[PDB]
Design an enzyme around this catalytic site. Structure first.
Site, short mmCIF file in Angstrom:
data_model
loop_
_atom_site.label_atom_id
_atom_site.label_comp_id
_atom_site.label_asym_id
_atom_site.label_seq_id
_atom_site.Cartn_x
_atom_site.Cartn_y
_atom_site.Cartn_z
N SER A 185 -11.50 10.75 -4.05
CA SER A 185 -10.99 10.64 -2.69
C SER A 185 -9.48 10.43 -2.81
CB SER A 185 -11.64 9.48 -1.95
OG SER A 185 -11.54 8.25 -2.69
N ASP A 216 -15.25 -3.74 9.70
CA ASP A 216 -16.41 -3.38 8.83
C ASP A 216 -17.27 -4.55 8.35
OD1 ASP A 216 -17.23 -0.90 7.46
OD2 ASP A 216 -15.14 -0.79 6.73
N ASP A 221 -6.16 8.26 -0.67
CA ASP A 221 -5.68 7.30 0.31
C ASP A 221 -4.47 7.86 1.03
OD1 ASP A 221 -7.57 5.31 -0.60
OD2 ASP A 221 -5.99 4.19 -1.64
N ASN A 233 -8.60 5.72 3.16
CA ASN A 233 -9.31 6.47 2.13
C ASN A 233 -10.25 7.45 2.79
OD1 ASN A 233 -10.63 7.08 -0.31
ND2 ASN A 233 -11.05 4.96 -0.85
N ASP A 266 -12.28 8.08 -7.90
CA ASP A 266 -13.51 8.71 -7.46
C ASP A 266 -13.31 10.11 -6.88
OD1 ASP A 266 -12.30 8.12 -5.01
OD2 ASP A 266 -14.05 7.13 -4.25
N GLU A 318 0.83 -1.20 0.00
CA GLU A 318 0.00 0.00 0.00
C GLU A 318 0.87 1.26 0.00
OE1 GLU A 318 -3.07 0.40 -0.53
OE2 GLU A 318 -4.07 -1.47 -0.06
#
Ligand SMILES: [Au+]
Ligand SMILES: [Au+]
Ligand code: NA
Length: 129
Positions: free
Chosen positions: A50, A101, A52, A59, A48, A35
């Site tokens: 946004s 989540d 990270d 995000n 989109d 990442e």
């Protein structure tokens, strides 16, 4: 801050991620490598709109506020810049909310595509943990 592998492993372990919702420490290290390359300052825009942020590329569409991700959430109730500090506490405590989540570590696209199903224990080989 750019962490060393074992350095990151140990910080992650201190902060409670080894087997957090069942993900061995190596899953977290492997994710972080893929990442951010272990760099706390990593930032990348998503398509989109946004972005990270940080060591675990969290995000602004759902997790933090960056002042330019229209119509998004801030479920970790932080500025996204907090995720960029040399101290990974905020990143870690927010990752905990994410991985819980219901979708687990699949939230991290790079984990799913590059860590999941692999020999993730390799990511902590040689570390004094
Ligand atoms: Au923590
Ligand atoms: Au830390
Ligand atoms: Na947001």
């Amino acid at each position: 801050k750019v962490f060393g592998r074992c350095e990151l492993a140990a910080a992650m372990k201190r902060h409670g991620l080894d087997n957090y919702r069942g993900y061995s420490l190596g899953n977290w290290v492997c994710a972080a490598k893929f990442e951010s390359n272990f760099n706390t300052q990593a930032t990348n825009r998503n398509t989109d709109g946004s972005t990270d942020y940080g060591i675990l590329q969290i995000n602004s569409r759902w997790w933090c506020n960056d002042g330019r991700t229209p119509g998004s959430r801030n479920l970790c109730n932080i500025p996204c810049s907090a995720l960029l500090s040399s101290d990974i506490t905020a990143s870690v405590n927010c990752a905990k909310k994410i991985v819980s989540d219901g979708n687990g570590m699949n939230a991290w696209v790079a984990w799913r595509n590059r860590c999941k199903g692999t020999d993730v224990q390799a990511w902590i080989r040689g570390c004094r943990l």
